[PDB]
């Protein structure tokens, strides 16, 4: 139960909390792709 | 460390080994004299040697020496002439050897100024001659006393010669003939192997290390055969095992003896009066060796006490008059809830914890107890204090009266000599595994350790 | 050369593991009770 | 033990001030 | 002359370094040692549960050193500050477990000052500063059982008793309340002390067996496992593994103070009908239930 | 330049320590602006997550909600007794933090990638420059003092806060008479942190909360002005090294202490954290168990009432450790000596029995080995927030201990090792 | 005869040697059986328990559980009379536990033989093999000697996370193993061992020699050296002034890091060996009698006895299904 | 064909078969 018009955004909201723990991973993915220099 | 003085001298290691042989036999003769001083020989039924902390005495009587020169025997009887070889002359012979080994170790320590494609082969025939001779002359009874054998109920143990059991029945641990046949066969094999290594054939720490391997492996085997019970550890000498309590082996044997005898002609009071007190005493959890404690030292009789006598078999009946059975204590439980079950398996009575409501309390279930055989034969108790008193006693198997003042007993179960032997030789095995590793590594690494 | 027989036989062994359980063969091979076989009713 | 409360309150004040003024000096 | 006191206190020439954390440590250690020893020997029984059933913790009231403890402050006090002067009498203070609160409130700051003293000497010796980081693991562990767990539970009677058997009693009661065995932070703590012991014995054995040469010490260890080799990385890992794990288990005790408990897999496997199929976790739960019912003085969910 | 281990001295796993140098102050800014976007991204995301899965039957604390209670406590979209009126205010707040995370995120990436490597002019700061860093401390102290008064102005004028202590349950109300009196406001700081006292965690009315924030907001404004105008004085020269990693460690120690206070605050306080939103405190849920047990049996006179060590009528048994708990549903039955026997006879409104019955099922004086819950286990939001923030408080104290020693060692010059 | 010795003794990625003919198949079989049991094999017919991933268990609750009590101390060989070659029966009676337990010993033996073989080949002292004798002593005492002394393999430790947790709790209630002095020396060995690990590693790290200029010191041209990477003098000065005493010799300290946990584990192995015969420690009958004669009297020892009573009664109906204990609710202990 | 091939394929052949079955148990209805 959320506002009626914004039911469609839906699963994108269900990803929104764990989007910060992906930036922590991309700090290691960027570190991977520069050779850990 | 300190004792590495004698590595560069053989004769002073013969001296050190003779010295150890002096200490071993000297202990064995004086430990057996200590046991003889403390031993009560009056009741072999109710105060046998396994209740009295006799360590060495069962090992002496295992092999045929069962008499004292005072006249008594550990079997049952009181010979006028007990023969030459008694517990005293076994002890004396060990003490006389010990002093003579003291004298010989001194001579070897001072006069050492006196070859191993030959020595181990010499040692192996000698051990083979001893082993074959022990099996074929001592144990057979041909030129010896024999060994202790008994029925599996442990009621009629005595010394007799034993014929070697040469087949697969001989590898049954409870067959006494196998041990005879083992010693004849391995004795021959060791003589053949020994004369092989005399005619057809480096570090002394390696020899020590491999000897320690034999010692720890044997110690576990010795601990295992002690704890599990074989022909070589009779229950008249070392008591019942924990496994005989586990499967109710004596309980089943007694009930077999009673159901047979009821079926012949007799009444339950007559049937249970035919159960030997010795047999009923084995079916009591304080005789199980798995009830002791690490620091509960001494004899089993320092615990529950001197048994006075069997009370008889308690039979419990509720208000319906249907037969009830207390669930017996397992070895694992220091205390166990007293619950009474009928023949189908339903709880009919118990001794509750608080006692808050019982629905099933003894007072409201109207449980009575009647005894057949023993001291209380023909007596019925109906008062709850009596019935609750005997229900707790029945949970430990057949009830016995104990005198706690003969040995000033403290009520805490001790393990038997069987339990003390098995425990120490497990410890000895674990320690000697480490010593084997320690000396094996030092022998294999004598160039990086030195 | 190397990566041909691994694209075939690695999902083949994963499928055979999958088909071991999904067809119930794992229950018979080990005697493991099925969910309706723990309490014989 | 109303005097002992004073004794403790002073003892805590003295030792803590020692620690405070110890790191106030600077080394 | 004040600088002279400043010079002696910070001097690295004494037999023991005092330092500024150490002038705030030897009083606290002075009190906490003195009260602990006196209470361990001679304290009268403590009504730990607050319901007038006193618990005898001291040597002179029936205990040996194995069973003796300084008994935690009474449940009646709760988390109240209970100094010796706020009691009505001296005996009422001893009855409500006053000495325990005296000991714990001097011992915990003294350890924190021991932490800072270890930093302080390392600074004055020109060392890198992080031995005190390593020591923060047993400090956090002991603060969790003596301070944080009582705060979360609302009573210092739930703290660790200061004795050998009281400690064991604390372990079993905690398992009943919280299922610490199935807590992953305790799982990490066990891996930290058992593995910490493993690495200690291994490092001890590897180094001592190469005294006469790391080239044959790594020819060994490289051959025993697949082929660090960096003494800095290895020694960091030797410090880090017990320390990090003990941090987690201290945080486990601390979060269990708020009743964030171990994993409950009771009734977690069901049959086709919905009958609970017991697992090993349910057996552990029954065992911990046996602890729980004896510790409870009125349960309200058991016939 | 300073973007690899060779020219920085720091390895990749310490790669943020390459922003310590004043050569790279522009990237220092972009790290912080991008990180604040990440904080706002979670705040928006978690709120919209909590709003999306929200169901109107279970109150707020039975749904794993930790952000929605914070919005409700400001009075945003709640009515009497903390019931949600409209979820759209909660949605409006969550979306705004997303947009704020986009602005902060974009500017964080701008300065970290596109902007200058070092700032210049007014925004150029050197860590060793005592006047400049203190000036930035002054600007930042002022801003949070601004926002403390903005929070107090919101409570006084713009909609007010949810007061659980309002009669008849709870209700949003303007805090029209905040406690400006300094002996009440600063008397909280000398109150001991122990039981019954509860140093600042025992603030139990909105007048004291709002009065304290006016005192905080103003003192932070005067402090901020003090640091902008006055550069650090000579007594603060050799107290510690004036380097960047020193300042980080001092923040870490303070923020570690803050998390511990917050963990205590969510665990014990039911004024700033009303129980209609966060659930009952464990002290208050044990009072709820005993109170409804009185109203069951009857329906120290009894088996549930004893004396406190101070001699007051309290709830008996295990919950006598919790006799200092005060709840807005219990407080109308509290006389001059603790619980009042006449008020536990006939004073109890249906809402207090309603409120206490909900808070029954939240109290760990039962069994853990079958289940300790309502349905099943039930970890409370107070448990989650206090556990999480104790963990943050501990690690940040460790991070304080780490950074402070390293700051000391690096200025004195022996952070790399000893001399042979 | 010396052909195969050359191939065993070779320079490859993993050394095999003569010990590897015992270690590698037995460890693979022991680990392979554990994975097989925890994935597919039930404990319904031995324990009335569900114990594999096929059942619905997770890692924390899967186990290769001990054999049924009816099996006694049988080896439960696949071709033995209990299974008679029937693999379904063999897994159902707990034959995988004996398979895992007995193959585990031979891999553990094979591993320590491998330690000896490599140390002999390289030419160093075999103290690692001496130190590994303590995990082997613990394993033999707990997994073999204890069930052998008891009534069946059933009472041994199951190969699982929660089965081990049951084993821990069983030893409190039934053996009071916390009060056992040998377990006490074991705990001192393990916590002291962990303490030595943390102090020594921190001491080395924080007394490192400054060699290079990088702010990460994991590369200061001294890690290859070994121990001489850190200042022994500064470390001794720190600990003689913080603690009072310091380990002044590097050989003695590393001897002590060997000795403390290894001796501790060997102590716990002796305590466990005693419990194979139910030889539990420390009655303290004076406190028991006094609390049976004075209701005012209670110690933490007598509280623990009551806790162990509660453990024994509330666990054993479920924990020993073959015994089929019936404890009515009234006979169960409680403090209610 | 010696140890290197047999060591990897004795420890990955069952390990992906088992992981195939454990993946299949997650979609078991009970
Ligand atoms: C805590 C305890 C300490 C740790 C425990 C470790 C102790 C290890 C020893 C355990 C002792 C076991 C005693 C149990 C009795 C039942 C065993 C049994 O019934 O098992 C003992 C076994 C099996 O015995 C079999 O017992 C059966 C009954 C049948 O009679 C078989 O014929 C008989 O072989 O005995 C055998 O054969 C074995 C004999 C090997 C002889 C091979 C020598 C070579 C012979 C050349 C010829
Ligand atoms: C909130 C998370 C966060 C943020 C905002 C940053 C931000 C930044 N990092 Mg980074 N970093 C992070 C987490 C983060 N990091 C983590 C978790 C690691 C370990 C994998 C790293 C390891 C790392 C390295 C090795 C470097 C950076 C660097 C940088 C800066 C420039 C990178 C660039 O130009 O593009 C930048 C401001 C670079 C830098 O120091 O700027 C000079 C760089 O050298 N970081
Ligand atoms: C202060 C830190 C904090 C606290 C106290 C909480 C607390 C909570 N979170 Mg949350 N969360 C956080 C940070 C925090 N979170 C961060 C940084 C993220 C981004 C990764 C999330 C993403 C997140 C999601 C997606 C969910 C939660 C959920 C929850 C609730 C149930 C926790 C649970 O059982 O999961 C288990 C705990 C562990 C596995 C450890 C709980 C009240 C759940 C919820 O109830 O939603 C309303 C849920 O679905 N959180
Ligand atoms: C902590 C917050 C913060 C701070 C201190 C700054 C500071 C600064 N920004 Mg910036 N910025 C921020 C957040 C911040 N920004 C956010 C959230 C955004 C997204 C809207 C931007 C997007 C931005 C742009 C596009 C530019 C700046 C620029 C600047 C510099 C302007 C100097 C001046 O005199 O005015 C200055 C260093 C200017 C610059 O790069 O200086 C040369 C500039 O071009 N910022
Ligand atoms: C605002 C708080 C704060 C800030 C700004 C810093 C900043 C810094 N710290 Mg740090 N630190 C902190 C708090 C903080 N710290 C706390 C609370 C602790 C206690 C644990 C530490 C312990 C610490 C150590 C030991 C070190 C630093 C170091 C540093 C410097 C380099 C670190 C780096 O490049 O990033 C690198 C980032 C990574 C390598 C990734 C972090 C990996 C962590 C352990 C995982 C996080 C777990 C997370 C909750 C779960 C993730 C979910 C999962 C799905 C991934 C840098 C200037 C280094 C230094 O001293 O340089 C001079 C260094 O050695 N810190
Ligand atoms: C000379 C001589 C003689 C005499 C002899 C004799 C008289 C003897 C003896 C002897 C003896 C009488 C002996 C002995 C012995 C003993 C021993 C040898 C022992 C011991 C011990 C031990 C070994 C122990 C130890 C310990 C303890 C103390 C306790 C426990 C622990 C331990 C182990 C530590 C004659 C005339 C005949 C001949 C000739 C000459
Ligand atoms: C060398 C190999 C020796 C082969 C012959 C060994 C058997 O040796 C002989 O065994 C018999 C068994 O009948 C022993 O005899 C023993 O058992 C018999 C019957 O079994 C009993 O009646 C008797 O009381 C007892 O002494 C003899 O004392 C011994 O002389
Ligand atoms: Ca509970
Ligand atoms: Cl208790
Ligand atoms: Fe080292």
PDB file of C-alpha atoms in Angstrom, chain H residues 3-28:
ATOM      1  CA  UNK H   3      47.934 -35.853 -10.372  1.00  0.00           C
ATOM      2  CA  UNK H   4      47.082 -32.375 -11.740  1.00  0.00           C
ATOM      3  CA  UNK H   5      44.186 -33.640 -13.858  1.00  0.00           C
ATOM      4  CA  UNK H   6      42.904 -36.095 -11.225  1.00  0.00           C
ATOM      5  CA  UNK H   7      43.145 -33.665  -8.311  1.00  0.00           C
ATOM      6  CA  UNK H   8      41.104 -30.925  -9.961  1.00  0.00           C
ATOM      7  CA  UNK H   9      38.516 -33.325 -11.459  1.00  0.00           C
ATOM      8  CA  UNK H  10      37.956 -35.286  -8.259  1.00  0.00           C
ATOM      9  CA  UNK H  11      37.215 -32.053  -6.407  1.00  0.00           C
ATOM     10  CA  UNK H  12      35.178 -30.155  -9.029  1.00  0.00           C
ATOM     11  CA  UNK H  13      33.211 -32.951 -10.717  1.00  0.00           C
ATOM     12  CA  UNK H  14      31.287 -33.824  -7.499  1.00  0.00           C
ATOM     13  CA  UNK H  15      31.372 -30.188  -6.378  1.00  0.00           C
ATOM     14  CA  UNK H  16      29.315 -29.039  -9.375  1.00  0.00           C
ATOM     15  CA  UNK H  17      27.099 -32.139  -9.276  1.00  0.00           C
ATOM     16  CA  UNK H  18      26.407 -31.393  -5.605  1.00  0.00           C
ATOM     17  CA  UNK H  19      25.884 -27.705  -6.338  1.00  0.00           C
ATOM     18  CA  UNK H  20      23.459 -28.798  -9.047  1.00  0.00           C
ATOM     19  CA  UNK H  21      21.462 -30.800  -6.535  1.00  0.00           C
ATOM     20  CA  UNK H  22      21.626 -28.146  -3.788  1.00  0.00           C
ATOM     21  CA  UNK H  23      20.364 -25.588  -6.313  1.00  0.00           C
ATOM     22  CA  UNK H  24      17.528 -27.997  -7.096  1.00  0.00           C
ATOM     23  CA  UNK H  25      16.549 -28.463  -3.432  1.00  0.00           C
ATOM     24  CA  UNK H  26      15.745 -24.753  -3.114  1.00  0.00           C
ATOM     25  CA  UNK H  27      12.760 -25.285  -5.445  1.00  0.00           C
ATOM     26  CA  UNK H  28      11.314 -28.175  -3.406  1.00  0.00           C
TER      27      UNK H  28
END
